[PDB]
RNA sequence: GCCGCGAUC
């Protein structure tokens, strides 16, 4: 007895700006959809940033090179703003080599396989003499959200050779999202309502595969309400007794005692096993010996002793 | 530790430290100088008759408890009169109205009163004096940021305190400008005025990321791209949190 | 927005600096928007320099006479794009903006006059039933940082 | 905006400032001492701003003023400054009366009082020789309060 | 004093008032509703002011 | 007890903070010790104990 | 000792009994505990471990 | 890594009485505790299917303001009482119901004529204490399916007056809620420690658990979601 | 083992 909303009457102002209709709604679910639209949209959108970059010349990020207009630092400023798009691949390596006099740009990267560069006028350094030359390697990756450089360390698993410039990451396509509620124009029923969806992104995304990708997220996380229902570790330690090379007479009388395990015979005090029968007393030294040998002193204290 | 009324154009009465030294560590105000004995003075504007004349004239602490000193905040008419016959004062040390044609000299300008510190805080009049203190000194402890960004809302004086604290690189003769690097910035210096023999370029070594006192970070970014003329004095590096030569 | 405030500090410490330094940098941010958009129509060179034009002499006999005619074209097109993120405009300490001169300004831009806007909540998108505040103010990042303390 | 200005301020001040007049006329016939007359100008200025003080808050108190189902009535102003001031949350209507009323007499180069007050609050503007006359009470509780 | 010390101030002040205040004329008058259940519903659903 | 607390109690209640005359007699109490003596017998004589 | 110092911000979602310590300081005045519990369950059988 | 999240596992839920509930969901990830806080509220709270009555027809003067013929409480006083009545009809949009009652004794929701098809759920509620005392009260209700709240903004309906002294008016709260209010708390899981738990609290004023209204909430929110999800759906 | 200087609440 509920209207199903359809994505009817898209319309696309700029590469950038996207108004995304949605015609028939109820009385009071515009606002909940277009807000619950809005944050999954600004909070976890997938999209396509620079990981890192090796220019050939540098060392680190606070260097300058020869020939060039800006500091190093700056390029990777420029860099970070690089917005691009990748089709099957997450590992996409971008190398451009520029030499001249003028701006060097997005247009001259090397045209890769199914790579698009959503805006080719998106400068990133300057060249300023004739015989100097730039030549960078660029590596975008796709991600969902902000992921700072520092952070991460899975990365440095391993060495990062001196050279690999870090650049943080930010994933998000989507910059700005606002909705709007008005009414529907459908005059057969009596009152419905209409909305309106204004987003602005980096040219990343497809603002109706963007709206898609929202909704089955919140389907997805919807999944889990509509069925609630619901209404001794040391390796030196576990092994066994007949390894610590002990004489035949202390073989006996651990049995006896029953000390199948290693742990078990070091949380004795010395106090305590002397009561034991035919002990001897050269003879716990020689337990003592072979266990200070281990660096296992007695006198510990355990939690837990599982059987095993 | 108080604020004698001779502190008018002489010492910041905003910019001081707070807790133990308040009222022994002060600022010169903006055009203040020494004597040539070591008082220090404040410029005045003559007043002749009931017109302000654009002379200027330098009064010690002294000298200035005797004439009568009008006020920057007063208006003035086209050819140089008082618009009212009653205009506020001040004699000595108190401030009263008095006539047109008793006034004998006229303030610069109203930022006379503040120092450097205190200048560069917009609607400086519609905040409290104690709360203009801690603003003024919280200023002089803010890092250089990564990129430096203009105030939307400033008071004019942060190009001076750029262009003079010696932070920027200003083009000493420069003309136009031949090769800009990241780190070096050559003019070749137009033909008017030239030195003669041996001709010459004027040649600028920018200093790149270096330690400060307070292990902050000091670079130096230039501002024109190529072949953009240059007259005397423009800014071509404008140092850490300074943009365009501004105050950032 | 960007940074979220406490109002309960203005009345008690009286920093109306605070206030109105919003107001008159909201009225600057929309006109530095009103430029960039222009900017994005790529719209003609007369256009735009008189919309400059008239945000430039705007005030109340002020000792500002800039004006665009003596300016030719390219350098036009570079203090627009120079001035894109805002209008850096220049209150001197004692003597400047005054609030009918931020009104103004702030009505050049299509912006409420008040300076309040209504702002609607992040997480449950009801309306802040009063209007709040907006503007842009310049934050200071002072050196007393926890990483050292 | 939420400052809001009383309209009887500038209208008191010129009457004020009449009364002033007068009695300086008065000091001019020679019938009237300097304390006296000093007396009086201190009298005469605490008392206009007491006035402007509580124009201030009639006009501010219940300034909102709401039809209801028939006619009009009027009731305590929803003024965010007047609510955060009666609150109690933060502030108080002497510190209220700096920012839409006068500032008021304030004097302490040596513990006495100027007879001229500042007749400017923060939300209009103060010139140089206000806020220098301010600045003595500031700095005199900043370093009061140190010692 | 034997006065709480721990009391709220601040903020929590002016939502305590600002919540507990009359207007003349809004939202919902005169309305009569079953206890203060209903009162959060009321306002959660903007009906009532 | 009655003039000291009084006098203290007046320059704290102006200023409008609330301090209890018990933790006022708990001070004047230890400004009560060390009397002097008129008479003697006991070991003592014109001292202050 | 066992004791730290840091700038202190809000925390509205806490407790009337309950403060945040950052994990960084906790791991330093907590260190001799922690070597109690670790030589405790066994992780670790000697202190330098 | 990408369009893979965190979905909420180990649920935890308290239930108290037989229309309290305080369900728990942990962990959810930065910023959708909110999301969907927010959102079921909002469904839970103005469109969810329900019944209550909305006419009401007392014998005698048909005004809003009666003297009551001494029934010992006001007839707003009664009108109150018959808001918080939760009733249960199947199958039917509208049906009429009626009370009679005669002998001192307050009057409960039991005393209502026997209608197989309206159910109630709580016959001890009391509407009144009877009139005085050696008297009678008459009184019909109607009660009708709706959705969500409806105030008494007007009848609209019928000719004139007639509607309106026909029903007096009487306040619907179609949506079988009484209070619904969520919480979002900070959880952790493996190194990961920004991440949000959901902690959703609901009273029912009967005729539906609260793990069903929460059911009924979850599923038409989703079943909204189709004409999106259908062509890029997993299975 | 300090002395000066600057800074924070």
């Not at chain 2, 030195?195 to 024109?224: F, H």
């Not at chain 4, 955060?84 to 009323?101: C, F, N, P, T």
């Not at chain 7, 310590?21 to 260190?31: C, H, I, S, V």
Request: include cysteine.
């Amino acid at each position: 007895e509920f209207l199903k909303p359809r994505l009817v009457d898209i319309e696309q102002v700029s590469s950038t700006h996207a108004k995304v209709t949605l015609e028939p709604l109820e009385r009071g679910f515009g606002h909940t959809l277009g807000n619950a639209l809005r944050r999954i949209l600004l909070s976890s959108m997938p999209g396509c940033a620079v990981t890192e970059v090796e220019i050939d010349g540098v060392l680190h990020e606070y260097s300058t090179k020869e020939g060039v207009q800006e500091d190093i630092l700056e390029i990777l400023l420029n860099l970070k703003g690089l917005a691009v798009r990748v089709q099957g691949k997450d590992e996409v390596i971008l190398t451009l080599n520029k030499s001249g006099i003028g701006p060097v740009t997005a247009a001259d990267i090397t045209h890769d396989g199914d790579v698009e560069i959503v805006k080719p006028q998106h400068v990133i350094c300057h060249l300023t003499d004739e015989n100097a030359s730039i030549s960078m390697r660029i590596k975008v990756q796709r991600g969902r959200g902000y992921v700072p450089a520092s952070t991460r360390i899975h990365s440095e698993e391993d060495e990062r050779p001196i050279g690999r410039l870090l650049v943080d990451a930010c994933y998000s396509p989507v910059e700005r999202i606002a909705y709007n509620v008005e009414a529907a124009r459908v005059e057969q029923r009596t009152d419905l309502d209409k909305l309106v969806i204004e987003m602005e992104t980096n040219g990343t995304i497809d603002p109706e595969e963007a709206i898609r990708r929202a909704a089955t997220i919140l389907a997805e996380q919807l999944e889990a309400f509509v069925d609630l229902r619901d209404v001794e570790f040391d390796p030196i330690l576990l092994r066994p007794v007949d390894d610590l090379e002990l004489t035949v007479r202390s073989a006996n009388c651990l049995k006896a005692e029953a000390i199948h395990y290693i742990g078990d015979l070091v949380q004795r005090t010395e106090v305590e096993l002397l009561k034991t029968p035919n002990l001897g007393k050269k003879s716990l030294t020689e337990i003592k010996d072979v266990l200070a040998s281990r660096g296992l002193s007695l006198g510990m204290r355990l939690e837990n002793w599982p059987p095993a | 530790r108080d604020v004698h009324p001779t502190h008018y154009g002489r010492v910041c009465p905003i910019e001081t430290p707070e807790g133990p030294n308040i009222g022994l560590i002060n600022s010169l105000s903006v055009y203040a100088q020494t004597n040539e004995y070591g008082f220090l003075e404040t410029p005045y504007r003559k007043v002749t008759d009931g017109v302000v004349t654009d002379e200027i004239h330098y009064l010690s602490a002294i000298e200035e408890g005797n004439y009568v000193i009008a006020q920057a905040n007063s208006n003035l008419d086209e050819e140089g009169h008082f618009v009212e016959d009653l205009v506020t004062c001040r004699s000595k040390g108190e401030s009263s109205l008095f006539s047109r044609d008793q006034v004998d000299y006229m303030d610069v300008s109203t930022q006379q009163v503040v120092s450097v510190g205190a200048s560069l805080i917009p609607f400086l009049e519609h905040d409290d004096a104690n709360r203009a203190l801690m603003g003024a000194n919280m200023q002089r402890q803010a890092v250089p940021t990564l990129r430096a960004d203009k105030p939307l809302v400033g008071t004019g004086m942060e190009r001076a305190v750029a262009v003079d604290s010696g932070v920027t690189a200003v083009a000493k003769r420069g003309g136009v400008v031949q090769y800009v690097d990241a780190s070096r910035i050559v003019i070749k210096v137009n033909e008017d005025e030239m030195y003669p023999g041996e001709a010459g370029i004027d040649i600028y070594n920018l200093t790149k990321y270096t330690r400060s006192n307070q292990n902050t970070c000091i670079n130096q970014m230039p501002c024109v791209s190529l072949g953009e003329p240059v007259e005397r004095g423009d800014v071509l590096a404008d140092g850490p949190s300074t943009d365009l030569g501004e105050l950032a | 927005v960007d940074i979220v405030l406490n109002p309960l500090g203005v009345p008690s410490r009286m920093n109306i600096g605070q206030i109105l330094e919003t107001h008159l940098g909201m009225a600057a941010k929309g006109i530095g928007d009103k430029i960039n958009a222009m900017l994005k129509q790529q719209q003609e060179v007369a256009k735009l320099r008189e919309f400059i034009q008239r945000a430039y002499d705007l005030g109340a006999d002020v000792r500002q006479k800039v004006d665009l005619s003596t300016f030719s074209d390219e350098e036009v097109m570079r203090l627009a794009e120079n001035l894109r993120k805002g209008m850096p405009i220049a209150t001197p300490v004692f003597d400047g903006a005054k609030e009918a001169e931020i009104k103004e300004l702030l009505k050049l831009g299509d912006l409420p006059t008040s300076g309040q806007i209504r702002l609607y909540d992040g997480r449950t998108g009801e309306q802040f039933e009063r209007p709040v505040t907006v503007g842009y103010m310049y934050m200071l990042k002072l050196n007393h940082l926890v990483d050292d303390k | 905006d939420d400052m809001v200005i009383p309209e009887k301020k500038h209208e008191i001040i010129s009457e004020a400032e009449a009364e002033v007049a007068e009695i300086q006329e008065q000091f001019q016939s020679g019938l009237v001492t300097a304390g006296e007359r000093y007396n009086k100008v201190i009298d005469i200025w605490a008392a206009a701003n007491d006035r402007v003080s509580k124009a201030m808050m009639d006009n501010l108190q219940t300034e909102t003023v709401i039809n209801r189902d028939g006619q009009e009535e009027k009731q305590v102003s929803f003024n965010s400054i007047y609510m955060m001031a009666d609150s109690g949350a933060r502030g108080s209507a002497a510190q209220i009366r700096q920012l839409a009323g006068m500032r008021g007499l304030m004097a302490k180069p040596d513990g006495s009082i100027i007879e001229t007050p500042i007749t400017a609050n923060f939300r209009e503007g103060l010139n140089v020789l206000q806020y220098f006359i301010s600045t003595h009470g500031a700095r005199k509780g900043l370093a009061d309060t140190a010692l | 004093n034997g006065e709480p010390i721990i009391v709220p101030s601040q903020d929590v002040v002016l939502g305590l008032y600002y919540m507990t205040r009359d207007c003349v004329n809004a939202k919902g008058e005169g309305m009569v509703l079953t206890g203060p259940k209903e009162a959060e519903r009321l306002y959660r659903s903007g009906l009532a002011s | 007890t009655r003039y000291i607390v009084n006098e203290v109690q007046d320059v704290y209640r102006l200023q409008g903070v609330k301090i209890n005359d018990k933790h006022i007699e708990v001070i004047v109490r230890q400004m009560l010790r060390k009397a002097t003596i008129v008479n003697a017998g006991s070991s003592d004589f014109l001292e202050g104990e | 000792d066992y004791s730290g110092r840091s700038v202190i911000t809000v925390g509205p979602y806490l407790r009337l009994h309950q403060c945040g310590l950052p994990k960084k300081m906790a791991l330093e005045l907590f260190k001799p505990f922690i070597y109690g519990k670790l030589e405790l369950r066994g992780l670790a059988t000697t202190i330098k471990a």
